[PDB]
Subunit: 182 residues, 4 copies
Amino acid sequence: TPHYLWIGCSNSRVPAEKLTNLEPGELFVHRNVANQVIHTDFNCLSVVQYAVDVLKIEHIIICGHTNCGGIHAAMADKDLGLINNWLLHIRDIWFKHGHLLGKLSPEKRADMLTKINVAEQVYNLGRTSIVKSAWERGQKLSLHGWVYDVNDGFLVDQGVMATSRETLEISYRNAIARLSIL
Amino acid sequence: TPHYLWIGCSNSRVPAEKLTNLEPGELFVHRNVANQVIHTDFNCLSVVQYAVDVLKIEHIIICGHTNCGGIHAAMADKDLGLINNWLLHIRDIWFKHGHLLGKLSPEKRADMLTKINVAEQVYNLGRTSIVKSAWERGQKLSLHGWVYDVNDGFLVDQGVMATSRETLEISYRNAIARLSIL
Amino acid sequence: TPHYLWIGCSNSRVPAEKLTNLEPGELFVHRNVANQVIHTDFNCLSVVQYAVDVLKIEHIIICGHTNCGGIHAAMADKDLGLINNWLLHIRDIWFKHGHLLGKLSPEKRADMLTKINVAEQVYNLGRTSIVKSAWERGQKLSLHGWVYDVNDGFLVDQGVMATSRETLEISYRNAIARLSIL
Amino acid sequence: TPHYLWIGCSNSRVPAEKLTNLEPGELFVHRNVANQVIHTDFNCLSVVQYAVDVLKIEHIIICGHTNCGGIHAAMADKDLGLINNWLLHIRDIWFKHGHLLGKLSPEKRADMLTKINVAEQVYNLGRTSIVKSAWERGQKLSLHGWVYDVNDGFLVDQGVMATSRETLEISYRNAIARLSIL
Ligand SMILES: [Zn+2]
Ligand SMILES: [Zn+2]
Ligand SMILES: [Zn+2]
Ligand SMILES: [Zn+2]
């Protein structure tokens, strides 16, 4: 069996199976643009459901990365057609935390939003009924939010790690709090 | 920078980077249950669009596989919540080719449907405005559909390969023509 | 309470509440382009779920109409951007029943596809777990497929009317059968 | 031919044709639970796109309403299957303005959130490439956001109205500014 679901970015500089030292065929993988878990996305949420319910996976890892073309385009003011719609979700976050990112130099900004994004996505994953109910029936399931420093090797980027719904709150809220005061 | 998009199954035994021999950084990856390109899926289309228009990728491979849970689930009679909605598209393909699969022996049906599905998804991909337009303005873009077997490798197929909308027809119809011979 | 869900086309020549003689605020309404019920559409399927489960509605009416801009564009070979993706579903039907429509004069065609579409959509609605489970717990729920002749007043367009899953099969299969032999 | 798009709630007490006094045939209608424009919803965007580009409509109205089940459900703690995914977007809006609503009295919260939601959805609509582009090539298009009350009529609001991306900002931020006064 696989023991982890890996939700990562479609981008190539992020190879899930290679960068970790984990055994081959242990990762059940979903990748989309800027690693998103949108409330109304049947594509991602099907993988999560197949993972949790069918494969009884005990760990979902969400994982962003620095220099993500996703995050950059999300902040660019440029019509690239259909991706612009998908990235508007990321922009909602950008402006949700706009005061933080406002302060930052216009490049720390890119990587900060990258970190914030993962937190927010773990937060979406955690409010999923797929996940929520797995918890409620006593299933062991932990969520995780990391960022792969593409020029280095990754950080358990955040204390954004839930094993229940309340631990989701503690984690996320602390995550956001911390990153809005260094 | 990337040069290929790979749309595969989320399944852990079909990792894109292991199963290809491209240079690292060259693959841009989407995975989802049973490797679908649904006409109205923002997530997958967002990736395709990002590949063709922004990254200017010139090859898309859709990789399906034998002994695939998605296909098995699509044929099974069991409720798996959201997964069911996702596989109703596959169940349509199962119905579209019911006569052919009706002939086949119950065991050989999953592997047939896996092969049909890869043809069908390439047919979807190619009918995309994203793709259609890329061709319509003369950008070079080839679609390839293959099937991987864990105990056996890629089935020497002859199978699915479009570089224009006209060849998409020729390749698609021929693939189905061939599968129908039994 | 309302007692019917009306899934109709966004188009204006089709006013649900007016054209019927039914009491005001009896119709819970969803309208989209060419009245579609796509397996993976959270928008429509949310209305259906709110209808069936929360409002305990006993009747879903799907209802197309003749001279539907949806059906026309679906058959047109013209890029209109984002709607083309949504209409590809209709095109899958067009070519599913292509031999029928092939025979017909190129305008009977428009209205035939309009009728076929409703049948197919009732069929999608009926394979929904939302609907299916309502049936399984003994809830009284009937589906219906009509077409509003925009220049006349409508026909229980088809014997496409399910009160369970097996009555869905009988109805749909007969529907398609009939319309492929006049 | 149409001249207005109406995006309203599916709710039976808020029928678009009754609540307006347009000539018959002029309204083009979308309804869904709690009148959302989600950035990655093919169904709603398909309608908008069809209105702006094909039908060349010059006004879009988003109509919300008081005592709306969608809003009530979004705030409630109950599982309603797919509906939950759909309302997580509304629950985000509830969180986005938590401080403001936190002030408010528990009863007055639904009606506040209904008002915020209409502002938010107009803000989404206006950030659409569909809309943005229409303006960007100088087509005339005005967005309007209103709230309807069954026992009272449309709340004399001053509220939400964009005819350009800059006015979308001005109108949106001002709407929120105003709602915040209490
Ligand atoms: Zn990236
Ligand atoms: Zn598989
Ligand atoms: Zn129509
Ligand atoms: Zn409502």
